Design an enzyme around this catalytic site. Structure first.
Site: not given
Lengths: 391, 391, 391, 391
Positions: C54, C107, C180, C205
């Site tokens: 983590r 988005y 973004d 993507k």
């Protein structure tokens, strides 16, 4: 001496640069050299380290070391199936003009390799009853290169005496004894300690244990291992284990001890249930005192396994009716998975063959083969019980 | 007819229950039946579907269909290495007493399989110069079962005429022509369209493209494919591709067209640089008009490849000095990766051998083999240029 | 300066103990220490190396370094989705009482996070038209902590001027500009070079490119990165990328340059086809001179992207008829895959809403969104052409 | 009612098209629709099936169903870490102005999220001793939205009464009770059966069991689960579990019952050894009659766990000396792996802090935390014994 769980979990580990707890997945084809000279030293066997995954891979090396530790042999080799382990071994040690002594009760694909494959390439093969020591003695020839054994073996869990057979084989100084130890596993049986030369496994079964990998393993002395690696695997089969699959098997081995313990605990309880059941006429299990070779099994096996076959008194239709009504046991080939698996060879694997042909092959109409899984035994028994009620 | 990128991306797909866009990874050993009767129907080849991953697997089937579509053959088979593809094929179609005609310039492990493996099992092998059509005609015998070819082939990128050789082979009605199409790939060369019977690949190289999988592929007619699958793979090699690796190769094939285009674009530019460089005395590249067999390459290859070998005029020390100074090109065996790879066989792969032994094997002291990757060509050239300055 | 392909392939690599060519998959939760003191030194930031996945992982570090190199920023952070990257960033840098200026064309899930999530936790959010510089200037407040931007942005590929907006934002010394950069990618646009503080991506993507991973990436200055890692990721989202997925993305990045080149080449050709097609009334594409903000796109984008939206003159039924007849393009959400994807928002993503509601959200009845893949462009066009014939 | 092993192995399975025995790895970002209308129906919740992996994935669904079955709750949700499960839950159910009652003895990252994260976003948090029922009653307010509990809890394996605390919390009709059930697991403790509203896990620990995955799980009623999925996970954390990791955890769960049984069997034997050892002054273990809350542990836990902490009488140097001499136990953070793990917080995790600061946090100089693994207990004890001899 460390216990088997300690060994399965910890043996054979290699260092990594970051001290990850889990063995890294070296998902690579090739390896880079620091210099031309380093590459040369690796090709000349003057410096340790890797070249190309078909030759070896660090993830796979851990697996190889682990299975060697479990079998108490010098060296391990991994392949991409049990048949890869078996074939790589045989192509290494045989040649045209050699002879093989083996059993007719061998894993089907091995039988096919022996009877139809090796024989096409000039190898002589004699099939005998290896439970009969005199038959084996009588089959030995000067050119016998391999005595190939399997115990327990399908479809009736036949037991043969590995130590005794190895002594017979070794009366010829050129003969190697090869044992397929898949069913028993090193939890139950360690053939190298009985004088066997090479152990082979389908790691697809118990060793991986999770029904998600096809893989094979070989354990033998270093001298033989290096030949199997650099001849059989490198050139004659190319059965190279994927690093991902090597990791899956290492991971599966973390629970090997406890899985085998539960498999056998469950199986012994199910054997008692089946052997007392009115619709079951016979149970095949190495731990039954009525099983042929029980005393041999008791000497060479620490426990009697988690495979059970049994004959339903109602024959062919009883087999299909039983299996078609089961809700927990899964209808499938393979064995050694965490899930209980079951098959009725007469209607399933042997569907192409007539009753006569099946019976010649030892497949009887009511024969059911059960690979006992890790489910709660009460649930496995409840499933079998309700299915048996429908016959 | 769809273009090659469309085909690589979309051909051969199988449905899945959830309509996932990516092909699911069927990381399984076995498959469950709905009934005993369904199991029987699958074993009797009366119903479609799966049994056990060594026989076939849905992820692997997609890969098999894709390579068959790319080569424009009927059927594909996948194995866990190129040597698995080659050996599985040869063990299927040969027997003791058969004869093989092939070249001395064959991939090293294939040469070893031919010269030391098959010959141990009663197969006769004749090594000829397959660039000499008369030598091949003269080597044909009544019992010639295989003519095995490779083009372009190491270490000088030898070109041989697949169509012409196949016509010679096929004067014997029992002879199969097998081509290792690894270097060229179906982007450049489609041997089945030239009359070849079986195509084999190391998918480890360009087809996967990402240096993370060992795998092989075979494409041939359905009748031969089924024998290679159910004899060679099933029993004689067990070289079973892991579903994870099958997925990696499918994934690699999504970029196959654009990777091959860039590999070749880069390579042609590097060939011009090397061939004009004062420290390079000779370049081996199928697209040079001075290369032997240039006209054959022009007829059977759509582009001239991304492998380049070259001779440094300064010999052995020049090879080591060049490689030891490179910062972008990686020192490693293998080829067809996205990263540029380079090797100097005289100091690396052939370090066990004397200069005399190396030269008999066609390895000269200044010979360097370059697998051109996908880096910006200006950067690859800058790296080679600075390394060459150090000689 | 190395080219973008060289960088994508080679940047950010870490050593491994065996010199594997492929980056090992460190599929581990935890890391072992050589001593208690070594553990203490790592927790005290006195010694380099790992503790727990983590916090960081060597496979993931390579990915992080690669995206930082591509964006030309100091530091990268990886998360298990784009929304993980976005949320981890926002939870780190905001607090109750802060203000955010952003666009209504964001988005959808980001819009929901802004409008319904952050506002529930005491953050003020103003939605403006960020193509109008005066609107943005007028929305700035003393407590504006974030100006959040996205370009090109759905559903009409809106373009906004990153450099100009960043200058406006930075009139407040406490304001961070977050972009973004998913659609454009660092192949086309590098917001940090225009004065932006933080770049976020859905690596799901283009960066991964293969439609098989959900993942996010952040690039920023080291000081901010360490806070996003040790606050946002560690405690407030726990959006920890799996090492397997990190490897898949590294692998995807090996072809990033050539994929983006082909995506854009294909897309420009398809734009010309669609924009001249009689059944298409309008095309939304940043490279059309008739697109709003074309001149801004030309200044800040090296190419104009591989997303295209277009309005069918026949409206709602034309959208469904087109999509239902396509055989190559796949009906799906997401973008940036090697396969061409297509959606008709009015009948698909916005099926819960009335025409009025859709139109308020900028979704018109004939609007189709196309993610152009890597198939041969002639085949993509043939598919669209035959589908358009059915309207 | 099926047993826990049967349930772990078989519960929650989904069909696949090929009847693979292993759950396929749906390593996909997106899902394809058969038609525009099918896409619309899925977005309108009118048809079952998938859209995009951040929303849900078939591999992950199996995992979710399995953990829900094990906890005997309605619905499961998976995330890419335990902190992902915890944060996604809290961001869903809280808002600025809400209040939380919890313990100071909470997992460190949860404490940080509570004390420094939620408080930055307008949430009031009161830390009390939740072993004192009156303290908890007195902390309740009208706006208390969450009572968050953990038992057993670090560093002294504190036990708190889940049923009793839940009754106190539920005196406010708007209060949700959330329990971190990581240490106990559903093998020992099922908080939902005691009136708790939401259970959270770090699946990184026992549930996966193999030290190779970071993951979290939530179990609750369907109404709450859908909000945690579609708000917390979808938008506010994006902590999306990778399908590969989902598969690893499913695979790990096949051995969950037998692993937990062996973990606890080993641990109880080690507790007896440590508690009788002259160099150990105190052992913290829920099953010791001298442990605070022993009677509560006996009521709510079926077994007492496989975590042990203990105080070495020789303090700080004794802790380091012990750990630095161990050969089998591994020095690392985390717990619940098949390998035994050990840490000395004063020299390791708490190295940045003074003795005074550590003691305020409940970390004493001789405190050692042991995660008992699956090795043979004789070997674990032999390792501890030889290490203890060196003090």
């Amino acid at each position: 001496k460390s216990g088997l769980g300690t060994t399965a979990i910890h043996a054979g580990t290699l260092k990594n640069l970051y001290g990850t707890l889990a063995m890294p997945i070296y998902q690579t084809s090739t390896f880079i050299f620091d210099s031309a000279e380093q590459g040369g030293r690796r090709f000349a066997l003057e410096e340790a380290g890797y070249i190309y995954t078909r030759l070896g891979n660090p993830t796979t090396t851990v697996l190889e070391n682990k299975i060697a530790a479990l079998e108490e042999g010098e060296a391990g080799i991994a392949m991409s199936s049990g048949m890869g382990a078996i074939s790589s071994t045989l192509w290494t040690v045989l040649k045209a003009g050699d002879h093989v002594v083996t059993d007719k009760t061998l894993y089907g694909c091995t039988f096919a390799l022996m009877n139809h494959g090796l024989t096409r390439f000039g190898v002589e093969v004699t099939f005998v009853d290896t439970s009969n020591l005199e038959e084996v003695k009588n089959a030995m020839k000067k050119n016998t290169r391999v005595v190939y054994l399997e115990t327990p073996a399908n479809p009736n869990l036949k037991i043969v005496d590995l130590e005794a057979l190895s002594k017979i084989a070794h009366t010829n100084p050129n003969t190697l004894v090869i044992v397929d130890n898949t069913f028993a596993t090193p939890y139950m049986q360690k053939p190298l300690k009985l004088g066997v030369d090479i152990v082979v496994h389908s790691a697809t079964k118990y060793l991986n244990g999770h029904g998600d990998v096809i893989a094979g393993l070989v354990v033998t002395r270093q001298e033989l291992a290096d030949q199997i690696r650099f001849v059989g695997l490198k050139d004659m089969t190319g059965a190279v284990l994927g690093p991902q699959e090597a990791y899956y098997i290492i991971r599966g081995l973390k629970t090997f001890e406890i899985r085998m313990e539960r498999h056998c605990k469950n199986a012994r309880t199910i054997v008692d249930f089946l052997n007392k059941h009115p619709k079951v006429e016979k149970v095949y299990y190495p731990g039954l005192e009525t099983h042929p070779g029980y005393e041999i099994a008791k000497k060479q096996m620490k426990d009697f396994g988690a495979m059970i076959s049994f004959e339903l008194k109602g024959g062919f239709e009883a087999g299909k009716t039983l299996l078609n009504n089961l809700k927990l046991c899964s209808l499938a080939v393979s064995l050694g998975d965490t899930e209980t698996l079951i098959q009725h060879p007469a209607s399933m694997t042997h569907s192409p063959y007539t009753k006569e042909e099946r019976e010649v092959a030892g497949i009887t109409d009511g024969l059911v083969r059960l690979s006992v899984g890790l489910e709660n035994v009460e649930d496995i028994i409840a499933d079998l019980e309700q299915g048996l009620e429908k016959i």
